[PDB]
């Protein structure tokens, strides 16, 4: 399964809003007018079709297993703050958690060229 952080496990989960914040469709109608279950933000309840969020099927399965925050609610999993600069918070390509570049270990100052994954998602070494 996907590992949860201790602070995620016991947090309140917002009532989910049963329509997509991007296209205004319910689970019955994504942008292609096809059924598609929503992913919902645990902080504000805003939802999105995975297709409208531009998630792959593989990321979708993983995010559905976790306490996920929407793009606007995303807070850094290390310091727990938003901070003022949005091009500074990376989103993990394995679990979609946010981390400020400055909060990575070691800190980053430049964008990775390809995928980026957080320390939670990197496996333990032999």
């Amino acid at each position: 399964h996907m590992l949860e952080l201790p602070h995620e496990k016991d947090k309140p989960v917002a009532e989910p809003i049963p329509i997509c914040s991007f296209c205004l469709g319910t689970k019955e109608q994504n942008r292609e007018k096809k059924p598609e279950e929503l992913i919902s933000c645990a902080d504000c309840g805003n939802s999105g079709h995975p297709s409208c969020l531009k998630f792959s099927p593989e990321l979708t399965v993983r995010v559905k297993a976790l306490r996920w925050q929407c793009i606007e609610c995303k807070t850094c999993s290390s310091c727990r703050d938003q901070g003022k600069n949005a091009d500074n918070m990376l989103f993990c390509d394995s679990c979609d958690r946010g981390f400020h570049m400055e909060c990575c270990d070691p800190p980053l100052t430049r964008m990775p060229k390809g995928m980026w994954i957080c320390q939670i998602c990197r496996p333990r070494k032999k």
Partner: peptide, 13 residues
């Protein structure tokens, strides 16, 4: 890689 900023742009705002 993605950031909050690129995700907003990718998904429409």
């Amino acid at each position: 890689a993605r950031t909050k900023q690129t995700a907003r742009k990718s998904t429409g705002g």
